Design a protein around this ligand. Sequence first.
Ligand SMILES: *[C@H]1OC[C@@H](O[C@@H]2OC[C@@H](O)[C@H](O)[C@H]2O)[C@H](O)[C@H]1F
Length: 185
Amino acid sequence: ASTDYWQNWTDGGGIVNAVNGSGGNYSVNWSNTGHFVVGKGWTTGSPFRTINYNAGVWAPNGNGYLTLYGWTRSPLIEYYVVDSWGTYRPTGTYKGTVKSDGGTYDIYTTTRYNAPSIDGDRTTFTQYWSVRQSKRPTGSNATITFTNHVNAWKSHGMNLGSNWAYQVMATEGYQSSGSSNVTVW
Ligand SMILES: *[C@H]1OC[C@@H](O[C@@H]2OC[C@@H](O)[C@H](O)[C@H]2O)[C@H](O)[C@H]1F
């Protein structure tokens, strides 16, 4: 699919050099950052979407995630399917596991209080996570069958909102540097 959305958020720390490339392609070169999330995807997420990507460069030098990333409202939820990371594997309150697309993911919840969201600078929301138990290889075509995650999350009382906002294959970083280049379809 053609991507129709460009995600490019930074809280303003350090430098985030985000390139909105051709088609579903983007690149990030980041340095000594605060918090940021950059990616390509779709303006309106769907629990039925199958996201394909190829991370031609996955080169974090510190804390970074290579992850499906998106939001719902009603309720406000930020969600993740993390396939790779840098120095630190993201974790939270363990709920169970789901197997999907050749990997086994732990299912976590965490919460943010008075934090930035699509609803404002200072808001409170639950974060839903599938995090691969070990890093997915990069450089070849990879699929995230998002419906497997949605259903597994439901089985653990993690229900997504009825109002879907954007849904992207992202590079997120925190207090780190690195490079990425990713193509999404
Ligand atoms: C998950 O990722 C980073 C941040 O989400 C941003 O919030 C502000 C909004 O305008 C952007 O589109 C989001 O990327 C959130 O605090 C964190 F929980």
